[PDB]
Amino acid sequence: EIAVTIDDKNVIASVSESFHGVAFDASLFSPKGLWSFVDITSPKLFKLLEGLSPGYFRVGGTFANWLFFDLDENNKWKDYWAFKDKTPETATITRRWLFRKQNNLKKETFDDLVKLTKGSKMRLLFDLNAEVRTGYEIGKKMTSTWDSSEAEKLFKYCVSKGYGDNIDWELGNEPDHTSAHNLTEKQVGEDFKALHKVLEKYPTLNKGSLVGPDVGWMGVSYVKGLADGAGDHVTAFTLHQYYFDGNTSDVSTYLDATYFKKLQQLFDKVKDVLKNSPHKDKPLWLGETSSGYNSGTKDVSDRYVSGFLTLDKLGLSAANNVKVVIRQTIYNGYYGLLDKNTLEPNPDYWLMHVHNSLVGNTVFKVDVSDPTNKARVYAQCTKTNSKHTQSRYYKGSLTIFALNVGDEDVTLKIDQYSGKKIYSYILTPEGGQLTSQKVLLNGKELKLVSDQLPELNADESKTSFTLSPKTFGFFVVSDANVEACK
Template sequence: MSRHLLVFILLVFTYNVSCITIDLESAQAVRNVSSKFVGVTLDSGLIVQRWKTFNLTSQKVLTLAKGISPSYLRIGGTACDRLVFNRTNDHAYHPLTVADWDNLNHFVMNAGWDLIFDFNLFLRKNGNWDPSNAIELLEYTVKQGYKPAGYELGNEPNRFPSANAISEKQLAKDFAALKNIVSSSGVPPFLTIGPDTAGMTPDYVENFLEAGGGDVVDVVTVHQYYTNGQKATLKDFTDRKLLDKFIPEVDSFVKTCNEKAPNKQCWLGETSSCYHGGAQNISDRYVAGFLWLDKLGLSALHGLQTVLRQEFYSGNYGLIDINLNPNPDYWLTLIYKRLVGSPVFDVTQTTDPNVRVYAHCTNVSSSIGYKPGSITVYLYKPGSITVYYILQYYRL
């Protein structure tokens, strides 16, 4: 007869903890996620600002990056549509220098990450995307032997100003051009990723996929934030109603992906607690872990394959701060990646309907050394307590 051991890996005591019963024996595996389910972003605005205090050659930054590998690193954001490669004298746009590109690629290789780069969609000719600058970057990439994992085109096209508006049909055509020029460049296998809409907007995504985008992209992406960081309050970060808004959004997005782009991956291509850089003195504190942990649990359970956290550095929601020190969500991300693996289980508990519970097979490939058969459970109770738990369960 097998015996079972339940070990508390992370536990912070508080004054109001419910005793609940979790049925793991009858839990069903419903999804699979990869080791790169959790990834990160760096905003293209950092390049415009000449990287601020972020240092791609810093041993400290590299050590923190290695801690959450393997991971995708997306270079995107609003400023991506203002970047050009190796044109320091083009005053209409901001330069992505050869040194920038070299440092980025060396950084991801040393960290054990995979690079995703978002090309400038505003470079246009006769109404179509002009790929000439992208071709220049791709030729250099091949020459140097760099191997980015994926390419995007434009950021949040559903919110472009009217002067730069691009229809879903035209965007699908532009993505087809992107895939063609990357395929022709001789780079190693890559992912075509998009359309990276602002919000989980079903109409724009559906129209893009129906117009041909569904045949072109390998990964369908949207962005999601809970609320405005300039108006968010501490209470928002444990508000069950706010958390629950994500459920119909992700279900609608996944449904659209499955119907209009079957067998393609569905990602959150950029996401965090609050837009506008996060909430000051909240998004970088322990309480932000409630939103982050719940989003990871729901995303895995409801069919997303990857979640890219905005962002590794910068803003109030950065995993590391302006002094390159880790914020609480960095440590939560590190623990999650060390312990949480695949498949994903649908678990139930009937003791307290307010407690949210998620479970996966443990990541047995991590350095911690857990054995096959281990299960990682993470749970918390929004609103009334100030603690979340990550637990281990395995057969002896």
């Protein structure tokens, strides 16, 4: 029904081996530390994160700009206007600042995060506070300089504990959108230059990635500002992306293929802003991404139907040589991968785990004949070393994956592999309901067991590349014997 060509001869991208990531929002902290519901210690969580490994665990977001390591009564910043209650005098001087005062990142919570990420083969990507600044004068002096004293308190603690081998750093978050000090593109460049100079003093903490500036399409000027100011010291540019407002959306929004292209346009805008930069080919990460902003869509974005945009994003990012995709959030909000209380995995968790199991980092271009875009196809090399695929598929195997938001059955006519052996991994909702919170792999429900991931049951009843309406899945062409994959 649908014509599909895969150019399996030309590698268009090579993503990170650590392609998958999850975000742990800094809004999980309070002045007293984590909210009481937050679980970063259950064996269960270690097993679920391992299922997305090797990957990234991002601690960050808007609230990172009022998080304080080991907050006590003597803290340097406690008497500073941006970290006190709003006054008539400070009420109109900021860019959308929330005046939430100070949250506490406790020593033992930072210990637990290092333990969790090390334990799960995840890197800890920590979002440092950018709104601790000197030189500002209310109503007189707009300019202000990043003050590294807070970051160095955490760096000294890391060195004291022998932490660092799995820690990556970023600084601030969406400065274009929310900022006490109205940070400019030039200031963010200067901030990253200054952080890189500090990290030079902590060599055990400076071997991983320094990424920024964590902006979406309205803030791409800050990517250019960061490239100009500190580009020679930045590993990768972190981008943020959401297709729509989750709060005004419903089940139909999550099936709407007109949204797909929003992601491509973000990548095009970044390439354009960088067109006159030595850093035009700097790796891009999605450092914080989901379908709906404003915490997603209640009782929708934690359900099966979230999977369509989730899968399209994973394939289109990889096709654009975006190295890392960090999903907002591991839990909390309506777009959580897990239930925040039970850690029970939502359908998007299972979709990411299956993608992580079957999909390697070498990427090919897929030409698909469907001007409607209701059917989306991607092709990358089968991952050969996942607990699933180890000694099961071998280098040269191709993983094709696809989604179908149409209300028809589609057959992908992939002539060039006609007569090859197909292993199918088809994800459908329990009870046929798009809002199901339970997902079937080839008719079997995916679930844990004494906190163990279930074995993936491949379906060897091949024959064609077909999707039922409103489904997605992966097809491993075990004997594709693709040269680029060897």
